[PDB]
Amino acid sequence: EKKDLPNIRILATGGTIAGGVESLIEAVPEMKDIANVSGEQIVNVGSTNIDNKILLKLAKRINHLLASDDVDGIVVTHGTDTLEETAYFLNLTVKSDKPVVIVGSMRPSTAISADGPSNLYNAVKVAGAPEAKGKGTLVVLNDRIASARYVTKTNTTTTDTFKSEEMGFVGTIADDIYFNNEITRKHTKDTDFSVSNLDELPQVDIIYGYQNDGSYLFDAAVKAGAKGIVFAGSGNGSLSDAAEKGADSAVKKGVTVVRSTRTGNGVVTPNQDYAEKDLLASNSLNPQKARMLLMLALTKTNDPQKIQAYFNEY
Amino acid sequence: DLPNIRILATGGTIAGGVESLIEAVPEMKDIANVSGEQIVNVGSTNIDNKILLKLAKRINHLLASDDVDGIVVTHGTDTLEETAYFLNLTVKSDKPVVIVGSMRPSTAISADGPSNLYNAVKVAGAPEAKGKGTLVVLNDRIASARYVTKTNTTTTDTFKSEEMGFVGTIADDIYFNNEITRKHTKDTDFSVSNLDELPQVDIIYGYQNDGSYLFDAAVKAGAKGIVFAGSGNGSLSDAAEKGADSAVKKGVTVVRSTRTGNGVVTPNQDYAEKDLLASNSLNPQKARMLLMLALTKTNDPQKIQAYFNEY
Amino acid sequence: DLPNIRILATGGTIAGADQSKTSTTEYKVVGVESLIEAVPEMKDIANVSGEQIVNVGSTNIDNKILLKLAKRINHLLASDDVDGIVVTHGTDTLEETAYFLNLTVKSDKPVVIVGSMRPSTAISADGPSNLYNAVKVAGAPEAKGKGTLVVLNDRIASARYVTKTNTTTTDTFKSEEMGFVGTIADDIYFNNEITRKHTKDTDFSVSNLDELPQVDIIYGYQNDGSYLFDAAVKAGAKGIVFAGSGNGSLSDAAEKGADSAVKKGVTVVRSTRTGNGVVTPNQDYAEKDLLASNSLNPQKARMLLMLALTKTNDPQKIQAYFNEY
Amino acid sequence: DLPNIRILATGGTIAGSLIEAVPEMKDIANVSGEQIVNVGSTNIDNKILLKLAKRINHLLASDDVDGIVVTHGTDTLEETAYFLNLTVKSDKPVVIVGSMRPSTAISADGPSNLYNAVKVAGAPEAKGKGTLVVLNDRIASARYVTKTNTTTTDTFKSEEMGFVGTIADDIYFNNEITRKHTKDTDFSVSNLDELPQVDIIYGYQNDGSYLFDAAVKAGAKGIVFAGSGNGSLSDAAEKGADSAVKKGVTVVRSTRTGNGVVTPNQDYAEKDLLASNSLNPQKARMLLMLALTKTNDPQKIQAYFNEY
Ligand code: NA
Ligand code: NA
């Protein structure tokens, strides 16, 4: 007597991106055509105020739901500012191949040509697509299906902000879904990370590189209890002499230091001079995404060679 | 006769001593009378305010003479955009200043430095380069210092502007396409002629679960200005906002930039009322250059904000 | 004291409608007054009025319509009651109309071309914001003298540099090499002024013309031939634009067809199928009057070639136009 | 021991005898080569494509060939690369390479391009990736790449699909494409001497039906239309396309935009004016020629356009 449709659960982390989560759901009635949609409010914060406590709660809830036969896929609604941080964390900690799609809107729900309704519809379409199984955590905005591993927010305000210059999208939407790429990095069900038994994460802070910078921010991070530091270096993870003094001091005090880049794209490569002093390379992870992997790495090991190996596979 | 172009070197060679650079690209002799000097010799992460003052003063002196038609500065790529934008605000001439580097070492297969240097000299000597602002020339592209950034760690095509494109491109001949709308060079209100140091400005990065303690440390270290590389449109966590508000109360100017890479950071009523300023379309490290220079003129947040909308 | 902005509607997706709100590629036809009433916020930034010029999908915009549109725009901008114009148009051939107007509008007052990638009925339809922003730009004092502009997705592109780069996405209109004249983030941020001659400063007028010289476009590919050149000449082409591989390159067969067209008095311009970059002069091709399209893609090169042929058949004068416009 | 990499040259040298020009290659491969043809890339034709695919298929069947590099002019490089992606029945790497600057120019890009092409062709992880295009430290799929700029060194790109990988000293593989290719395709051309004729017609304002009519008269078996936007036709172009279909020609609507998918449109699909998916006109031509070696059924041809 009923139409068979996928069971998609929306987990909201902030306000409504289209139009409570119950209403959010009624603002995009088109979703009923393609899913049996249900919803829950996890937390309710602006994305700059998403923190490690919330991430642990969110990953645990997703893992619980996806283990059930009554949930086919999940859509997480989230503020765009830090969406990429949450999406990549879930990419490393969700231990299921069922789809998890993270979505937001660049224009408020009340704005002229608000982008939330289409984004949400498309997120639910992807989350219920059989072919979305096994693709890793996905970010869906503006008719594009991006991997959490490769995507970033590239522009402050534009609808088309989430992109990957060098890796493009997993797929795109033009009425139908077109899947184009599968990523090569390890993810989701295949990672070595679990947050099932964790109530906190190792502290990791980020320091920026620039002309005439110093060592004082490294020293402050160490004093504040950082277990890891990601440095957003100029170019290919480069450090001034002052920054390198700070990084070396941190390493000597037992902090793991990973060199990322402030440029936005490309790989940070191992460099003999840096590698021999355990100033690690972030691969193609930007500073905030490198932080997520470093926190998780530090739950498993303090060995710099093992952490570097994670940065090449995840 | 040909334009007289002076090369000021700040690092190692990008092609083939400053005499070595010139000899490595003999083709330059057909488009300019090239001479050169070594200003400093450092990796670009070690370019600092002292060096920038020296470089700006030397450039301003040289461009005032009739024997110099234009200048090329050879520089490491990592912080090239910081130096280029600083010079865009402090060189008080319409004569061309072109910043150039290479992404591959001069000894590598298919080294890019020889072409880059040749093109930089071609642009520096082009009459239509007059009045364009400071330019950055790599990989057949002519970018404004105001809009360009290094977007990729290692690729030859790294210097770009997604939203503003290039001032021009080269395909044998130079094709000039755009003139920027921001105030620059000859028309700025900044002078560093008599300065021996610049107001200290530090940069703090925004991220989930960040804090106030890095703001506190920058203030303790003597920052006069702080640029915050905020997520999205210059957004702050509650903790970051506590740190920023603390800094403003201690007389530090705080400018919100973005970590995203592109777009404008807009004035936001909640932030603006608390003097947490907006960086416009300046990224953190370029915002830092304008904030340092603004602080040579004023501590008034409304005046500093107006500079961020015009420069 | 608000600017007086006239909307001239021509058709396109922005005036299209489907009964399914989730259809972005299938749709049926909305009137200019409906477009306006759908965006009441416009009343706070302009005094808006509208007229329907034509009502067609943009692949059916033709030279007759362009002439009508350019003449109407020129007459309206001569009045003190009109501060700026917005043209609503289908996206498919928007760049052709925009660049034509960039060469034939004899005023420094703003002309902004706008469309949408989703129909008016779609969820998160993009037309309302695009239209608001087009009106905002057309009424901005700083938009004066910028050349014809194309406004979609919070971006303000020059007609000379923009193209439709994607079949279906909202962010399709871009210039990889030249970027945008400006962008919108609440306020307008003007960033660039183009260097090419435009609008009031061109040598072209269409005030006395009822038709344009026929120009056709031929595409380059492996195993192509001469017979499509021959067919374009037979069909009455006065000019041909060749969308060559790479930097306006021709196969031997294509070069045979081009050379035969030139011998019959047709002007041939080499453009590129790549999408970006400059088609440079080439000594061997220039000696045979196979001209270079500069940074004009095939369809935009066609617009300039048609107007050049209203002034001259001299290949050196035509080439000079391609370098300045 | 090092992989055995064979270089098939189609024209002039892109570097500098290549081993002399780029001696670093000796440390990463045992290189050999041959001059299979000697033409400018605008004059690569169907006869040459068939010769190249037959020769590559033969070579890769040998146990002592680990991978192939083809040096090729950049203008039509994407056409050859995609054809080989559909016809090389092996998982071993085939890498197509060119240079945007002449070998004699300042900062010639060919030496690095060639070195990287050989590095990729010998990399174990390049197996099963489909035909690759390697220029400017980037590793692009033949299925997604195009030449996007007339003259720049960074011209080969895919805005929407990115690269299969990139090179920064080491190779970083990032994506595997989802379309069917190489070892898994249903196309076999080793015994064919010609391919069904396919021509391309451009869409623009004030276009007509005359070019369609001429292509049909010239013997086209298929026509790719480089339509404005999402494979759109003017009324005049549509009349020409419908005339062609009635005369037994298969018509595929591609796009002149450069990116995105051309979607099936009900009114066009009802009339067998097919959709090219995310294939540009010149790449859609290669798939249509091969489709026409198997069938004239428009539904089957459309299905090929959705999978390849
Ligand atoms: Na450097
Ligand atoms: Na349309």
Side-chain angles (χ1 to χ4, degrees), chain A residues 235 238, chain B residues 42-45 75-80 102 150:
Chain A
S238 299
Chain B
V42 298
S44 73
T45 57
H75 193 288
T77 59
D78 294 342
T79 71
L80 191 156
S102 68
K150 185 177 183 172

Side-chain angles (χ1 to χ4, degrees), chain B residues 118-140:
Chain B
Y118 180 88
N119 282 332
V121 168
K122 189 183 177 69
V123 173
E128 291 296 299
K130 176 181 148 189
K132 293 289 200 283
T134 306
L135 302 170
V136 170
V137 172
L138 285 89
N139 194 39
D140 301 314

Side-chain angles (χ1 to χ4, degrees), chain B residues 126-167:
Chain B
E128 291 296 299
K130 176 181 148 189
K132 293 289 200 283
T134 306
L135 302 170
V136 170
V137 172
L138 285 89
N139 194 39
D140 301 314
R141 311 308 214 292
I142 310 165
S144 176
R146 173 58 180 74
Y147 300 140
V148 81
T149 195
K150 185 177 183 172
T151 67
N152 191 295
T153 57
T154 67
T155 56
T156 63
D157 56 299
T158 185
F159 284 92
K160 310 182 183 165
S161 174
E162 286 296 315
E163 297 291 303
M164 300 85 173
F166 298 117
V167 161

